Design a protein around this ligand. Structure first.
Ligand SMILES: [Zn+2]
Ligand SMILES: [Zn+2]
Ligand SMILES: [Zn+2]
Ligand SMILES: [Zn+2]
Lengths: 620, 190, 586
RNA sequence: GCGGUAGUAGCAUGCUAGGGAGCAG
RNA sequence: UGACUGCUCCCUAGCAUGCUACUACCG
């Protein structure tokens, strides 16, 4: 906290990797043997050898991921398009990347029009398209890191909020695992820069044996390895016309972050009935179970949701450090005290402030999160819980204590002030008491910066529980953003669920004998997915009939909506599926002579196959 | 599947038993036929099953070892490629200015952000518009980072040559404006 | 892990584990080699050893395959499968083998621990890849033998031409002269530091090297054993006499360096190789120099076998050929750096086979075939792939330092493949013109091996002397001494005034060191001392045993001196063959 | 007379591996 | 040029378990 304030005086060219000259068989290299953080000060590597013989495979991998050689063997660059610090240009040309439009499925559009759709004055219309971008879009989108400013925190209050958050994250287990227990799916994805010139992640997960991976992972508990992050543009459907960009992290960072965090990440995504709902599905009655869990037994229930403007470009560094420290608290037996600090330093040097490669040039990332590391959503959930806790603390500590009728709450406020500003060490009894109070009067359900809260209403009116105004104030003074209350909702009737959670609305329908909650999407999104595709081979329905089956699975609960076009969407999808099947069979029987059969294929255009996906019985 | 060790015995016993049956002998020979053929087929059963299990096991082993060999070959070639890339990028370090600024350090360590700033030979500037252009690289030589640079070439967003005589206020709206200027260090490195 | 087997050239994945060089063996070949020989270890992509925990068996005929690993009789699962069956080992490409019948000779090559003459007989009597494998494993075993020696513990130095140096405990004194190079590396605190390329004189330690270092503490003199790389090209390429002179350009004029050099070119321009069959000082030097300007537009390579024999390699090249046309290749040991190092484009490169800048040519010259093995021929054929080349050298010279053989001497037919290639079908070239030499060597080596194709060019005044003295031999260490040399040098310089400035052939280098300590004569090496001979030389007794005197060590020693060649009859020599003047000692 | 065992065929259930596709943060 | 997770549908291959069936052996 003090280093953050003091680092704003010193010049910005004295931060980052520290390099020196080493000799390998009489030839000189330039490698990084330390780091200078704005928050953590000066860090020196522990195992550095100047004179050495011919190097091995993992040394080659480490030296090929360091930005030192790439920056030192490049040209100077002065870029006036952005205000962020610039390092070097790797080539003699600047690359401009564009985004192409979508492909039009005319047959589906004609079929939909021939059934009374897209008429004037209708309540269902297309507002999801593929937007195109011009040459200078990647740099324009990268220039949004100017909203990240150095922020000092109230340390005596953060040191209590972190205890409450750790109490929230208490029902799991974690630790370190060996290289043979790591689970990777889709090994056919990119490996980052400069490793994308020779293959995908399969090549590097096959060429490296198990003890090589173990030695590489054990190397990062005594040294710091800075890497390079590549920025890519997305090609997907959306409702707004701004460019979207994701970050491609290097393989040397992901390979070790998996071994560090995967056990805890898998343990979190396997628990039901907790605050974090990552891993729970919405089919087979999952949505109803989540909604019933979040309602708990609150006394005067209302519902509330909020929004984070520029969530990843504006999150201060201190909260990211806090999230990493909270996640790394499960290593009390497998790791020493220096190993944990060096792991934290490696994480900070790789995914918090490092060189990014936009276009064909190297830039310096000021701060924030790089969406695309191995621990994105869980860290976002920790950050969301931290913000909710500090909002509750600010709401309770800023109330006239002479007007609180209940004496228990008055004593709670007195003890809260004493534990914040008059106590130096942790007091577990009051932490447990405050955690119980929060869980009784303020219930949460969190999924990576999306949240729904069921709170006591009279307590919030009297000021003993956080409100929207408290969230606005906390965001203003701790996140450097303004949160307009036009993107937040409030629901005073519990028979209708949250107004929006994970882009889905909620309706209470009668199925069987009882009443359950079902989610339904926006009809415009489903129709836009039907009519606008990436690829040309998806404008011929017979080649892929399984797209429309999934799209009709997503659009089933629209048949219980009181509005009439909403069910017509599902019926139109079923008729199109039947038409595509008939087209395929006849269109194949005609020129060729192969005769097709309709055995157990009619299930796809009858509603009973889709009705079974929202009824609690858990198949496959 | 036809020349198994027990096949000869099984077939010979079957042929002899069926010849005895075709001889029309008493029921005792028929009972002996039935017992002998039953036990013969029973003993042929495992000899026909175990061999088929073993062949599939051997085939799986061969496939696994082949894929291991392919993985090793790929590892060797990627190692060669990485070594070549490193040794190729080594040859542009300008080993006199770099040595001159390394020796001035009190322990050999220097920040990475000041190596291109003091040892690079070429500079690239990207200019949004003309107002920014006339404040940064006006003329033929300009000063930046406490050094003197002289212009060598100017291209546009389409990578076509542009002469400085036509970068004016009137002619500004006729150029693909993300201009890229290339300069050399004067009196120092190139 | 995948390649061709040394006999069938078929694809395999099996490596024999009981052969020091780990050759690639075909599955049927693997079975034949493992059955008829106590070579019971086979390597694959994974080793063929029992993986049962706590177990240790390294056979191949004993293991059973089960599950995914390999198991033995004591741990075979119910689902087991023997690896060694059907006379064919289990490995990749098992269905695309052809086998071979040359397994007995391959077994003999593999099993031969290199003891007797038959070792080299069968080394030179086999098919091509077996020749390559035998040469590789011969150099491997000799380098292992010489690395099985101690480290020269040195902590101080007296002065120049003096040294105190100690070997290890249980290790004997290594061989003496530069034939076994002494190149060591000391340590200061953390790594190794340079010492110098040296060689020792006696046991007083004079320095016959070419540098002087601040030698004292922590010094480690060692005969550096080097890892041997595998061969690529065969020992020789079968020649075919061309009709077109492709690339070769006989100039309009005649660059008349030598007269018969025109015929030289005439028959070396068409066949894929040749050889300069040169008696000492008989055009063995500058015929290539004449070829340099008669064929100036031809890429011409020059090489030898040792860094010592570069005299004629380097002198006349700069002496008469143009300055720029020459080029120098030297690792950086101490040798002639007269031309330009670090130059890839040139038409006349002069070096040794130690290290060259990888390129191909169309004309090469290669010196010192007598002490050249098939390994050196293969490496020069691999590094340089040319159209024609000449191997300078003569069978009437010394063999390579093949200290491996002890029973039978290695004769001309056993030098290398080429050295008998020109012995059976005849030499590519045969000269008969001695540049500067009386007819003593003419008579001697023409009655012995030259078949009298060269005759008297310079007159025979019979000033050379050979006496009736015999000598007495005594062994002390791996070098011996001679009392009828300590006394005999004086007894032979008693009154004859002509051989006081003669050169001392050294069958025993320690004896030459003692002679230098007592009376004083220059030390003259035997093997790598051709062309360094002066005008006047003494052939001394120095031995009677089978160390040096059967035929081919004195064929060049008789040519060291020109007029006054004192070659006394030492032992069972070629006494009753010629006429020689004699003076009886008092 | 009943049971056990050994193969063979059809059917059902849950995992692992491979491929194609959909949604969400 | 194509990041990190979560859930779901379809197709094929293998393994394990269970149900039924057909012969044969044994008591
Ligand atoms: Zn740990
Ligand atoms: Zn062997
Ligand atoms: Zn073979
Ligand atoms: Zn065993």
């Amino acid at each position: 906290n003090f280093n953050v304030l003091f680092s704003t005086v010193f010049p910005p060219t004295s931060f980052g990797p520290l390099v020196r000259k080493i000799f390998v068989d009489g030839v000189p290299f330039v490698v990084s043997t330390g780091y200078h953080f704005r928050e953590l000060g000066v860090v020196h590597n522990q195992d550095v050898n100047l004179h050495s013989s011919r190097l091995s495979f993992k040394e080659l991998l480490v030296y090929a991921a360091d930005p030192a050689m790439h920056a030192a063997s490049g040209n100077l660059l002065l870029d006036k398009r952005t205000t962020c610090f610039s390092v070097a240009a790797l080539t003699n040309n600047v690359a401009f990347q564009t985004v192409k439009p979508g492909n039009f499925n005319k047959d589906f559009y004609d079929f939909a029009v021939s059934k009374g759709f897209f008429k004037e004055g209708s309540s269902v219309e297309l507002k999801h398209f593929f937007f195109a971008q011009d040459g200078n879009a990647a740099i324009s989108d990268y220039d949004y890191y100017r909203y990240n400013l150095p922020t000092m925190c109230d340390i005596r209050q953060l040191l209590f909020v972190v205890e409450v958050v750790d109490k929230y994250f208490d029902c799991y287990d974690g630790g370190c695992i060996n290289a043979n227990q790591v689970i990777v799916n889709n090994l056919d994805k990119s490996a980052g820069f400069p490793f994308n010139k020779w293959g995908k992640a399969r090549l590097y997960y096959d060429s490296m044996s198990y003890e090589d991976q173990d030695a590489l992972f054990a190397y990062t508990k005594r040294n710091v390895i800075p890497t390079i992050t590549q920025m890519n543009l997305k090609y997907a459907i959306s409702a707004k016309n701004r460019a979207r960009t994701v970050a491609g992290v290097s393989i040397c960072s992901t390979m070790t972050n998996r071994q560090f965090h995967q056990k805890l990440l898998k343990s979190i995504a396997a628990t039901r009935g907790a605050t974090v709902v990552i891993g729970t599905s919405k089919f087979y009655g999952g949505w109803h179970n989540m909604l019933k869990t979040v309602y708990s037994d609150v006394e005067n229930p209302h519902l509330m949701g909020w929004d984070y403007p520029k969530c990843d470009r504006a999150m201060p560094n201190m909260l990211r450090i806090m999230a990493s420290l909270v996640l790394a608290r499960k290593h009390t037996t497998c790791c020493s005290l220096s190993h944990r600090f060096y792991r934290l330093a490696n994480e900070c040097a790789q995914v918090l402030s490092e060189m990014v490669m936009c276009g064909g040039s190297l830039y310096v990332k000021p701060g924030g999160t790089s969406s695309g590391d191995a621990t994105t959503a869980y860290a976002n959930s920790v950050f969301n819980i931290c913000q909710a806790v500090t909002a509750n603390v600010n709401a309770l500590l800023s109330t006239d204590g002479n007007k609180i009728a209940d004496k228990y709450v008055r004593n709670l406020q007195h003890r809260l002030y004493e534990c914040l500003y008059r106590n130096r060490d942790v007091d577990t009894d009051f932490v447990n008491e405050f955690y119980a109070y929060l869980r009784k009067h303020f219930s949460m359900m969190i999924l990576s910066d999306d949240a729904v809260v069921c709170f006591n209403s009279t307590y919030a009116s009297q000021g003993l529980v956080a409100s929207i105004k408290n969230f606005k104030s906390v965001l203003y003074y701790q996140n450097n953003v303004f949160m307009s209350e036009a993107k937040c909702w409030t629901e005073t009737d519990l028979t209708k669920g949250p107004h929006e959670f994970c882009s889905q609305h909620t309706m209470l329908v009668k199925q069987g004998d009882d009443y359950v909650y079902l989610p339904y999407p926006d009809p415009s999104r489903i129709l836009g997915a039907g009519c606008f595709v990436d690829d040309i081979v998806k404008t011929d329905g017979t080649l892929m009939i399984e797209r429309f089956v999934s799209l009709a699975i997503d659009a089933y609960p629209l048949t219980k909506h009181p509005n009439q076009e909403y069910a017509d969407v599902f019926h139109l999808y079923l008729q199109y599926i039947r038409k595509l099947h008939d087209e395929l069979t006849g269109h194949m029987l005609d020129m060729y002579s192969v005769m097709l059969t309709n055995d157990n294929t009619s299930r796809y255009w009858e509603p009973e196959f889709y009705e079974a996906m929202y009824t609690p019985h858990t198949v496959l | 599947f036809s020349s198994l060790p027990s096949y000869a015995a099984f077939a010979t016993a079957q042929e002899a038993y069926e010849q005895a049956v075709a001889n029309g002998d008493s029921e005792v020979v028929l009972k002996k036929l039935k017992k002998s053929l039953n036990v013969a087929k029973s003993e042929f059963d495992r000899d026909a099953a175990m061999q088929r299990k073993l062949e599939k096991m051997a085939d799986q082993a061969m496939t696994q070892m082949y894929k291991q060999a392919r993985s090793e070959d790929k590892r060797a070639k990627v190692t060669s490629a990485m070594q070549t890339m490193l040794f190729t990028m080594l040859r542009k370090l300008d080993n006199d200015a770099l040595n001159n600024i390394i020796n001035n350090a009190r322990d050999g360590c220097v920040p990475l952000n000041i190596i291109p700033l003091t040892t690079a030979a070429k500079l690239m500037v990207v200019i949004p518009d003309y107002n920014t252009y006339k404040n940064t690289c006006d003329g033929t030589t300009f000063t930046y980072a406490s050094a003197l640079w002289e212009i060598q070439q100017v291209v546009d967003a389409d990578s076509k040559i542009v002469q400085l005589s036509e970068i004016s206020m009137d002619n500004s709206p006729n150029l693909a404006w993300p201009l890229i200027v290339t300069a050399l260090r004067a009196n120092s490195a190139v | 892990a995948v390649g061709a087997c040394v006999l069938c050239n078929s694809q395999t994945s099996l490596r024999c584990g009981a052969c020091i060089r780990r050759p690639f063996l075909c599955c049927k070949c693997c079975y034949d080699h493992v059955i008829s020989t106590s070579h019971k270890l086979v390597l694959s992509v994974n080793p063929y050893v029992c993986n049962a925990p706590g177990c240790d068996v390294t056979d191949v005929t004993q293991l059973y395959l089960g599950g995914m690993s390999y198991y033995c009789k004591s741990h075979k699962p119910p689902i087991s499968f023997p690896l060694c069956a059907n006379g064919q080992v289990f490995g990749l490409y098992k269905n695309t083998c052809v086998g071979s019948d040359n397994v007995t000779d391959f077994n003999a090559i593999a099993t031969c621990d290199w003891t007797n003459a038959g070792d080299y007989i069968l080394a030179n009597t086999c098919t091509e890849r077996l020749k390559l494998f035998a040469a590789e494993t011969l150099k491997a075993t000799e380098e292992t033998f010489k690395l099985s020696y101690g480290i020269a513990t040195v902590r101080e130095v007296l002065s120049d031409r003096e040294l105190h140096l100690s070997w290890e405990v249980g290790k004997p004194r290594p061989p003496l002269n530069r034939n076994y190079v002494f190149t060591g590396y000391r340590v200061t605190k953390n790594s190794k530091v340079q010492i110098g390329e040296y060689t020792f004189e006696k046991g007083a330690v004079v320095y016959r090297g070419t540098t002087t270092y601040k030698l004292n503490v922590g010094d480690y003199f060692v005969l550096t054993s080097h890892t041997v790389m595998p061969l690529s090209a065969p020992t020789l390429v079968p020649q075919e006499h061309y009709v077109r002179i492709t690339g070769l350009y006989p100039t309009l004029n005649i660059s008349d360096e030598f007269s018969s050099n025109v015929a030289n070119y005439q028959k070396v321009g068409m066949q894929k190789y040749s050889t300069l069959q040169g008696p000492p000082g008989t055009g063995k030097s500058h015929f290539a120099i004449g070829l340099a300007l008669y064929y100036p537009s031809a890429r011409i390579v020059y090489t030898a076998c040792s860094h010592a024999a570069v005299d004629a390699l380097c002198e006349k090249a700069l002496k008469y050929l143009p300055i720029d046309k020459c080029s120098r290749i030297i690792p950086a040991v101490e040798c002639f750096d007269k031309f330009k190092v670090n130059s890839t484009l040139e038409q006349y490169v002069f070096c040794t086979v130690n290290a060259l800048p990888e390129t191909t040519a169309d004309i090469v010259v290669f010196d010192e075939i007598s002490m050249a093995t098939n390994y050196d021929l293969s490496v020069v054929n691999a590094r340089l792939r040319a159209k024609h080349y000449v191997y300078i050298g003569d069978p009437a010279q010394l063999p390579a330092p093949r200290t491996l053989l002890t029973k039978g001497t290695l004769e001309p037919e056993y030098f290398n493949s080429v050295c008998r290639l020109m012995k059976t079908i005849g030499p590519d070239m045969f000269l008969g013109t001695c540049r500067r030499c009386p007819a003593e060597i003419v008579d001697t080596v023409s009655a012995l091996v030259y078949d009298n194709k060269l005759k008297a060019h310079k007159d025979k005044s019979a000033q050379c002397f050979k006496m009736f003295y015999k000598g007495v031999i005594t062994h002390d260490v791996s070098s011996a001494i001679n009392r009828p040399q300590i006394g005999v040098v004086r007894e032979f310089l008693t009154r004859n005034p002509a051989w006081r400035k003669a050169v001392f052939i050294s069958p025993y280098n320690s004896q030459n060191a003692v002679a230098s300590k007592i009376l004083g004569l220059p030390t003259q090496t035997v093997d790598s001392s051709q062309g360094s001979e002066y005008d006047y030389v003494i052939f001394t007794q120095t031995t009677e045993t089978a160390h040096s005197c059967n035929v081919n060590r004195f064929n060049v020693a008789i040519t060291r001196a020109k007029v006054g060649i004192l070659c006394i009859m030492s032992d069972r020599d070629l006494y009753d063959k010629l006429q020689f003047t004699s003076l009886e000692i008092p």
